Amino acid sequence: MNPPPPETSNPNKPKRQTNQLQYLLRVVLKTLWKHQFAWPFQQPVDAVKLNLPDYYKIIKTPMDMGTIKKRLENNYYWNAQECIQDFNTMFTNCYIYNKPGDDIVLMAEALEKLFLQKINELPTEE
Numbered sequence: 835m836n837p838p839p840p841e842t843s844n845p846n847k848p849k850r851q852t853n854q855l856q857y858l859l860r861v862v863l864k865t866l867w868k869h870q871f872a873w874p875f876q877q878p879v880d881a882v883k884l885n886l887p888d889y890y891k892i893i894k895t896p897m898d899m900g901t902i903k904k905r906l907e908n909n910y911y912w913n914a915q916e917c918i919q920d921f922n923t924m925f926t927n928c929y930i931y932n933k934p935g936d937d938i939v940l941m942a943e944a945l946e947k948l949f950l951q952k953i954n955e956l957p958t959e960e
């Protein structure tokens with residue numbers, strides 16, 4: 835069985851639009867989403883279909899770009915750091931579960947390189 839996905843809606847949660855969060859959607863997410871290696875990361879890991887009964891025994895804070903995209907589009911976040919953390923959780927989970935040189939790790943590394951290049955130009959909050 836898969837767990838429920840991370841939440842993307844929560845009326846109780848304080849949230850904002852900031853220029854940094856707008857950059858995270860329009861520049862960061864858009865750049866990674868269109869990449870040829872984005873597809874494994876565009877939705878929660880389906881441990882049933884991938885036949886990974888241990889995945890959610892090991893990965894206790896799952897995250898994926900489909901969730902991040904919905905969070906950004908639904909203005910779920912309060913600040914850029916919350917969203918940056920989600921991207922880092924996604925990459926770290928892949929490295930925790932998999933092994934160096936696996937195809938999925940090479941894919942995550944390519945996306946992470948672009949992520950770092952784009953967040954290096956995150957605008958000053960204004």
Ligand SMILES: Cc1cc(C)cc(Oc2cccc(-c3c(C)nnn3C3CCN(CCN(C)C)CC3)n2)c1
Nearest residue numbers: 873874875879880884886928931932936937938941
């Ligand atoms: C066999 C295959 C290879 C590749 C590149 C992608 C694959 O499909 C997907 C689809 C959605 C997510 C993921 C995924 C994420 C995110 N992180 N880990 N994963 C998998 C974890 C299991 N691995 C099993 C193969 N190892 C044991 C070598 C494969 C990677 N993978 C399947």
Ligand code: NA
Nearest residue numbers: 910911912916
């Ligand atoms: Na948040």
